[PDB]
Amino acid sequence: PEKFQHILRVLNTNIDGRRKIAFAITAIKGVGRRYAHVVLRKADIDLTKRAGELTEDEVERVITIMQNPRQYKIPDWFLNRQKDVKDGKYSQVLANGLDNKLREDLERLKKIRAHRGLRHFWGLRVRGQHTKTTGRR
């Protein structure tokens, strides 16, 4: 049923309305089938709906939970950026914000010329895996 959206634009990313909603959201950077399913279950949604249904109030309602997980009892654990060094915050990042956090960490260590930083800088395997044989590109 429901003849409306089909394609959807949220948080600078797109989303397939033609996809099912838990598995549609995940197309945003910083939300995975876990966190999506949670974010929807807090929102109280017929998650058997496609995203090409779902009233625009509802997609706003989801987004708000998604951005503000701790206000809606999405607990500690379910958060990609916990106790994040730059300030004492524990939260979930989303979209290009995530990517910017990432770059600020690899910057941070590059600035510290840390062993990990350097191996990022050099474009190596960083989590001390062997490299004689593998990751050849």
């Binding site: 089938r33 876990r34 399913h37 949670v38 279950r41 807090k42 009892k73 999405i74 607990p75 379910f78």
Partner: protein, 141 residues
């Protein structure tokens, strides 16, 4: 007509429903958020899963008594994709099996037996056996 006599799949369904209709189990606050084991990629689809697990738990206890949490994990066990390394057993969630057992304790479906663990309790034995009768009188099929 006891419960052993019945198709156990379609039993736990009516048991859970029974446990839903009563409406005094004690589903915790996590439920929504929690995974259900280290096995699982995801949480359950059936949102009212707790009712289902309790049932399966009680219906096991009808079958094998004296079964603690540890017991419950090993039963609620299975495969553990470790991705690119090969697979193993993983023990189910301790807490969900503890909470289920404490929830059936509060119902007085179950009771902690001597020699440790839980055995399902007389008043409980009633209920499971009662719904077995229900299912057997569903139809000739």
């Amino acid at each position: 007509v006891t419960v052993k006599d019945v198709n156990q799949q379609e039993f736990v369904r009516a048991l859970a429903a029974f446990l839903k209709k009563s409406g005094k189990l004690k589903v915790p606050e996590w439920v929504d958020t929690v995974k259900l084991a280290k096995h699982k990629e995801l949480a359950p689809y059936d949102e009212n899963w707790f009712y289902t697990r309790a049932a399966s738990t009680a219906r096991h206890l009808y079958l094998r008594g004296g079964a603690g949490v540890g017991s419950m994990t090993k039963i609620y066990g299975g495969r553990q994709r470790n991705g690119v390394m090969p697979s193993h057993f993983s023990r189910g969630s301790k807490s969900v099996a503890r909470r289920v057992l404490q929830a059936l304790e509060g119902l007085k479906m179950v009771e902690k037996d001597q020699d440790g663990g839980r055995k399902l309790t007389p008043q409980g034995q009633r209920d499971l056996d009662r719904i077995a009768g229900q299912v057997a009188a569903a139809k000739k099929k």
